Nucleic acid binder design. Structure first.
Length: 568
DNA sequence: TCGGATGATAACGCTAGTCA
DNA sequence: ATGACTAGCGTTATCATCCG
């Protein structure tokens, strides 16, 4: 029913895209091979084994999502081969002779994205297209194959986005591109802060700077490097590392996944800029957002409004929505047009008037007519509220409301929050993750009362009463900052603070807090004689506004650590 | 690194038995 | 007097960094 198409994570070999397209063309050598060999010899389950060989024998080839993708196991190494695509493609080292459900879903998304495979909602099945057919038949290495692929690419909005981002001839990194790809600052579109990354890459021992290169990247950064990799093979972009001088002086770090645009690339843009209709599917308008439905369609309707009309006032736009079923607000409506613009659709702006200067092919909005019945969640409502109140603070930072609620995002929250304290509140300092460092070190340098703070961030799903084990971790650090013995924690993280600081507070940042945040807090305070506090993301934000507006200093806050919860 | 690979998680949805 | 519904809990869609 609800699926996510349009965004492709894993897949990188065109070599394998073909095999997957071909499995859909009865007359191709691979259709033959996968069906006659691959499937019967790799799908151990007899029942399924036979069933698939069969589906592949029909006259009019049509396979369902499950028939092509299958399933997978919790312990990825113990998984069997349950589907057509799995069976078609091989492991990285031939560990098993097949790929998993995830990578398989990946090849499906990629092929559908480039328009070789069509999706039939009703049946939840897919079938080859005219260009797919033509793609298969094309010879490998063909100038035809190339032109077929290049024309495919030009119809893929997010790939036009990468190209656009590099018109000026800059050398952008997967982080710079990531920032502006897709619905940025949302559940499935989070990006790693290049600042923090380079910094650690710099002051960190070699025994770890490799792991932290291959590992450090958000979901949007993955898409960026990947779409950038396709364009590279197609010759429209040039992938090359970018060195950075980060004096820890005249030091040099590097981010390999960086790109520059080419001439052929520029020609592509010129053409596909109106000087090739783009395909857009509703499933593309949001990936991992818990509120996929509401938002994907609200945005779909907005695109409809803009396709139909031409140069409307954001008020006219708001107006139309109110009629189609969605009573929204300027802040949200603009934010969505920010995403649509980001995924690669060309929408022009003149003050308070917007006009789509692009040709996108008509698409379907599932369960239409019942649109007016779609409810807006409490979280999405909160977001608007925030988007409304936050005048000085970039709306990107509203992503924190989400990350902080995601248990899988401990890593990045540590990064995003220190970033907010620094770039907005203005504190000086550093992010310090680890098992021997508190999540962050913060310090003032201007106030009449110059102080420091020890920070710990915690991504916890719906609620958080400061656990005793975690609470004491802080005590340890609070303590180490006093007894600065290098024979105790020889990494000497305390050394991040200016020698001159003496006033240190301790702080915990999370989604929401409950019933414990005071008990172990008061404890910590009494023990080390350092008073600290507990703080939530919403307040962190509506504190960043205040510090910017003029409504809040960096002293009233130092006077906020009341061994309880901070509230501005 | 390249091109995926991994264990996790929340929404889904199937069963079996309640609710109206 | 039986279809509509759902607590419980195994299944599926989808990550968000990871890694051989």
């Amino acid at each position: 029913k609800i699926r996510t198409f349009g965004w492709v994570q894993n897949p990188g070999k065109f070599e394998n895209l073909k095999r997957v397209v071909q499995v859909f063309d009865r007359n191709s050598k691979v259709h033959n091979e996968v069906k006659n060999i691959k499937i019967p010899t790799l799908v151990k389950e007899s029942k399924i084994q036979k069933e698939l060989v069969a589906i592949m024998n029909q006259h009019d080839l049509i396979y369902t999502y499950k028939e092509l993708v299958g399933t997978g196991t919790s312990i990825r190494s113990e998984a069997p081969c349950d589907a057509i695509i799995q069976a078609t493609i091989a492991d990285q080292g031939n560990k098993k002779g097949y790929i998993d459900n995830w990578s398989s879903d990946g090849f499906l998304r990629w092929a559908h994205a480039l328009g070789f495979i069509e999706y039939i909602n009703k049946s939840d099945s897919f079938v080859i297209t005219d260009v797919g057919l033509a793609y298969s038949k094309s010879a490998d290495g063909s100038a035809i194959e190339k032109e077929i692929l290049i024309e495919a690419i030009s119809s893929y909005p997010p790939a036009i986005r990468i190209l656009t981002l590099l018109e000026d001839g800059q050398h952008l990194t997967k982080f710079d591109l990531g920032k502006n790809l897709g619905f940025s600052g949302e559940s499935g579109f989070t990006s790693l802060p290049e600042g923090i990354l380079l910094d650690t890459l710099a002051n960190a021992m070699p025994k770890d700077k490799g792991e932290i290169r291959n590992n450090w990247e958000g979901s949007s950064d993955k898409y960026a490097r990947m779409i950038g990799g396709w364009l590279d093979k197609l010759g429209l972009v040039k992938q090359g590392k970018k060195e950075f001088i980060i004096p820890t002086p005249d030091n040099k770090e590097f981010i390999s996944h960086a790109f520059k645009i080419t001439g052929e690339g520029l020609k592509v843009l010129r053409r596909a800029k109106g000087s090739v209709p783009k395909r857009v599917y509703w499933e593309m308008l949001a990936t991992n957002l818990t509120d996929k439905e509401y938002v994907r369609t609200r945005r779909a309707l907005i695109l409809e409004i803009l396709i139909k009309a031409g140069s409307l006032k954001i008020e006219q736009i708001q107006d139309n929505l109110k009629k189609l079923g969605f009573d929204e607000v300027i802040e949200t409506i603009e934010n969505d047009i920010k995403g649509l613009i980001n995924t690669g659709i060309f929408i022009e702006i003149k003050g308070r008037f917007y006009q789509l200067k692009d040709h996108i092919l008509q698409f379907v909005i599932p369960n239409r007519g019942v649109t007016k019945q779609l409810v807006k969640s409490e979280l999405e409502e909160k977001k608007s509220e925030l988007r409304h109140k936050l005048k000085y603070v970039p709306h990107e930072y509203i992503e924190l409301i989400e990350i902080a609620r995601n248990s899988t995002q401990d890593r990045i929250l540590e990064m995003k929050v220190m970033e907010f304290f620094m770039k907005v509140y203005g504190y000086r300092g550093k992010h310090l993750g680890g098992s021997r460092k508190p999540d962050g070190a913060i310090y003032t340098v201007g106030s009449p009362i110059d102080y420091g703070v020890i920070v710990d961030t915690k991504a916890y799903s719906g609620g958080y009463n400061l656990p005793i084990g975690q609470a004491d971790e802080m005590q340890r650090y609070v303590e180490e900052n006093q007894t600065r013995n290098k024979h105790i924690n020889p990494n000497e993280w305390w050394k991040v603070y200016p020698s001159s600081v003496t006033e240190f507070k301790f702080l915990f940042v999370s989604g929401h807090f409950k019933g414990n945040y005071k008990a172990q807090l008061t404890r910590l305070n009494h023990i080390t004689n350092c008073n600290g506090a507990v703080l939530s993301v919403e307040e962190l934000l509506i504190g960043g506004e205040m510090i910017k507006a003029g409504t809040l200093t960096l002293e009233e806050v130092r006077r906020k650590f009341n061994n309880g919860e901070i509230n501005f």
